[PDB]
Structures are given as structure tokens and as C-alpha cells.
Design a protein around this ligand. Structure first.
Ligand SMILES: NCc1ccc(Br)cc1
Length: 246
């Protein structure tokens, strides 16, 4: 997250921190995700497509820090790693960039809701906020495009939704943005998602309900003029989510 503010998991208790074990046993951060039901975390396919083996992954809930334990956190294995079979990536845009992780602990349990672990509501089908609506994004991604390190402490910021028409202008993203994506940015371009924020939540309030409107997917750099963050438009994937979560 470029700009924005530090936070803790209490302010985004559906946020899932996803890591990968290497041969040798090194563990590194991969991507964010969102708890949509006790057993299901939703994220982005591009986070996993190069290492699709479920056994490599570790998912934490209730975690506010990248490389230290947060009191009350839960650790999970990945029982099913479900990537979208129509996923595609051209030089910039990721299409159908959505993934499901069925989580299960060493004791064989799903997520147990607490002060630091809660689910987020999915939107109703094709029901998104109007352009100009302020939404929030959360993650452990870079604080500056030129950074090497990721922040140790979770961050959040606010971005405003941009219409399909504005985002499809050639000087934004042209035909790279489809109706299954949502663009969002700051009016001054001063805050945004960045590398490491992929898979995490774009949350908007719709009818007074906090809603998983988007999943951090792609962008040309970070906090750059005319280059919004692009998000998987969750409200256009409800049949796929329904068909893969029983
Ligand atoms: N590389 C993932 C990513 C997505 C959106 C923005 Br904005 C920046 C980076």
C-alpha cells in the first residue's frame, strides 16, 4: 500500500495472509486474501499460477504483522487450491484473476470467528457502488514502488471507484480493462495498491454493509497518474464462486 495508514487486523478481520514454503524450508509472503466463509479464502489466481501445488502454502488469519506472530492468529494448510480455468495474462491485464483456497488447520478445522477473525460479505450480482465511491484496500505490499522490503505492519488506504468509460480510455488502460474488472484510484494519485497487495480486499459499503467489491489484481506501476489499480469485479463472478464452494 502506497500512502495510507498502518492498521491492525481488528480493522480488517477477514484479511488472510498467504505464504509459500520453499524446498529448503524458507517461508515467504505471497499475497493477501479474504475470508468469505469459515473454510474459504478468496484471492487472485495470478498469486498461485506458477506454483499451483496446494501443499506449498500456509494461510494465516488474525495476523497484523508480516514476519512475527500476532497474538490470537490461526494457521492453516490449504486443502484445495482452486484457480480459475479461464485465467489469462497478457503483458499487463490479468483476466479472471480469482482463486479460492479451502483452508484447514493441523487439527482439521476451518476459521473460528473472533475479535481478529471474521468473514466479509460478497456483493449481490452486478451490484457495485457508483463511480466516485470511496472504498478501502488492505495489504502487506510495498509502501513505495522503489522499496525492496515489504512493511512489517499491515496497511490500509482509501481509493475511489472509476467508471469503465474513464478507465478504458487509451491513456488509462484502453481495452485491457473489461466489465469483469473495476478500476480505483486516488484523485491526486497519491495512494494505491502495489506489489504484494495482490489477492487482498477492496471493500465498499453497499446498503450499509461492508462488501468485498474487488480483489487486488493488476496495475501499471503504483500511485501513477492515469494508471489506476485494477480489481477483479467480484459481483461478476458469483456463479463461479457458487459452483466451486459447494
Ligand atoms: N502487482 C500487483 C498490483 C496491483 C495493483 C497495483 Br495499483 C499495483 C500492483
Amino acid at each position: 500500500i502506497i500512502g495510507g495508514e498502518f492498521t491492525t487486523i481488528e480493522n480488517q478481520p477477514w484479511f488472510a495472509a498467504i505464504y509459500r514454503r520453499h524446498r529448503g524450508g524458507s517461508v515467504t509472503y505471497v499475497c493477501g486474501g479474504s475470508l468469505i466463509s469459515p473454510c474459504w479464502v478468496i484471492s487472485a489466481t495470478h498469486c498461485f499460477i506458477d506454483y499451483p501445488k496446494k501443499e506449498d502454502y500456509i494461510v494465516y488469519l488474525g495476523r497484523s504483522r508480516l514476519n512475527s506472530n500476532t497474538q490470537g492468529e490461526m494457521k492453516f494448510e490449504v486443502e484445495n487450491l482452486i484457480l480459475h480455468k479461464d485465467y489469462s495474462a497478457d503483458t499487463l491485464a490479468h483476466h479472471n484473476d480469482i482463486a479460492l483456497l479451502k483452508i484447514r488447520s493441523k487439527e482439521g478445522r476451518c476459521a473460528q470467528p473472533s475479535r481478529t477473525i471474521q468473514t466479509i460479505a460478497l456483493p449481490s450480482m452486478y451490484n457495485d457502488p457508483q463511480f466516485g465511491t470511496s472504498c478501502e484496500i488492505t495489504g502487506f505490499g510495498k509502501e513505495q514502488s522503489t522499496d525492496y522490503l515489504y512493511p512489517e505492519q499491515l496497511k490500509m488506504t482509501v481509493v475511489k471507484l472509476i467508471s469503465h468509460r474513464e478507465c478504458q480510455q487509451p491513456h488509462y488502460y484502453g481495452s485491457e480493462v473489461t466489465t469483469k474488472m473495476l478500476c480505483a484510484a486516488d484523485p491526486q494519485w497519491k495512494t494505491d495498491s502495489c506489489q504484494g497487495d495482490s489477492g487482498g480486499p477492496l471493500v465498499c459499503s453497499l446498503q450499509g454493509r461492508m462488501t468485498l467489491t474487488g480483489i487486488v489484481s493488476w496495475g501499471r506501476g503504483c500511485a501513477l497518474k492515469d494508471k489506476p489499480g485494477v480489481y477483479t469485479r467480484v459481483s461478476h463472478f458469483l456463479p463461479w464462486i457458487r459452483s466451486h464452494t459447494k
